[PDB]
């Protein structure tokens, strides 16, 4: 029943940036790094929909060609 200590907010967000780890599957804050948080590691979710919020493809990103799709 106690909110996060400011020092623990900083710790959480710092360990959200650990390069030697798979990028976290969420956006933890809105700031200058919002584009990086939004776009990084965006292609694996289409083959692993069990790890998506509602197993919803419409949340994911799929690469496909406009003309080859015919």
């Amino acid at each position: 029943e106690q909110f996060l200590n400011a020092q623990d907010i900083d710790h959480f967000l710092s360990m959200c940036q650990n390069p030697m780890q798979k990028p976290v599957p969420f956006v933890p804050v809105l700031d200058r790094r919002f584009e990086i948080f939004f776009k990084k590691d965006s292609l694996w979710q289409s083959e692993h929909l069990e790890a998506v919020v509602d197993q919803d493809v419409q949340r994911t990103c799929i690469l496909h060609g406009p003309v080859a799709a015919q």
Partner: peptide, 14 residues
């Protein structure tokens, strides 16, 4: 009290 704790610690460290 929960909001005052959050303000106090943010203000303290910053």
């Amino acid at each position: 009290e929960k909001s005052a704790y959050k303000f106090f610690h943010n203000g303290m460290i910053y």
